[PDB]
Swiss-Prot record:
Forms the phage's tail tube composed of 32 hexameric disks. When it encounters the appropriate initiation complex gpM and gpL, it assembles in hexameric rings that stack on top of each others. Multimerization ceases when the correct tail length is achieved through a mechanism dependent on tail terminator protein. It comes from Escherichia phage lambda (Bacteriophage lambda). Multimerizes into a structure formed by 32 hexameric rings stacked on phage baseplate gpM and gpL. Does not multimerize in solution without the tail initiation complex. Soluble major tail protein interacts with tail assembly protein GT during tail assembly. It comes from the Viruses. Residues 6-84 form the BIG2 domain. Residues 49-91 form the Big-1 domain. This is Tail tube protein. It is found in: Virion; Host cytoplasm.
C-alpha cells in the first residue's frame, strides 16, 4: 500500500505483427535514481487472443489467435505506465 513506483520508467515493447503460434518479447526499463525496486508489472488488455508473461523486465507475448492485442503496463499505484500492441496473423 505505502510504496513508491519510481521516478522514470521507459518501456519499449515489440510493436509489430506475429505469425500464428509465434510470440514476441517486450523490454522494460526503469531509472528512478533512488528507488531501485521492481514495483511495476505487465498484463494483457484482452487475453482472449494472446498470452502475456512478464519476467526480468521481459514480457513475452504469444499470438493465440489472429487479431490485435494490446498490453498495458502499471507501475506502483499508477505512477508510470506503458502501452503496446501485437498483431496476430491468421496464418
Amino acid at each position: 500500500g505505502a510504496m513508491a513506483a519510481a521516478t522514470g520508467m521507459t518501456v519499449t515493447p515489440a510493436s509489430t505483427s506475429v505469425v500464428k503460434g509465434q510470440s514476441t518479447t517486450l523490454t522494460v526499463a526503469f531509472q528512478p535514481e533512488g528507488v531501485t525496486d521492481k514495483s511495476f508489472r505487465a498484463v494483457s488488455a484482452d487475453k482472449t487472443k494472446a498470452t502475456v508473461s512478464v519476467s526480468g523486465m521481459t514480457i513475452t507475448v504469444n499470438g493465440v489467435a489472429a487479431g490485435k492485442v494490446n498490453i498495458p503496463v502499471v507501475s506502483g499505484n499508477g505512477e508510470f505506465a506503458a502501452v503496446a500492441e501485437i498483431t496476430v496473423t491468421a496464418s
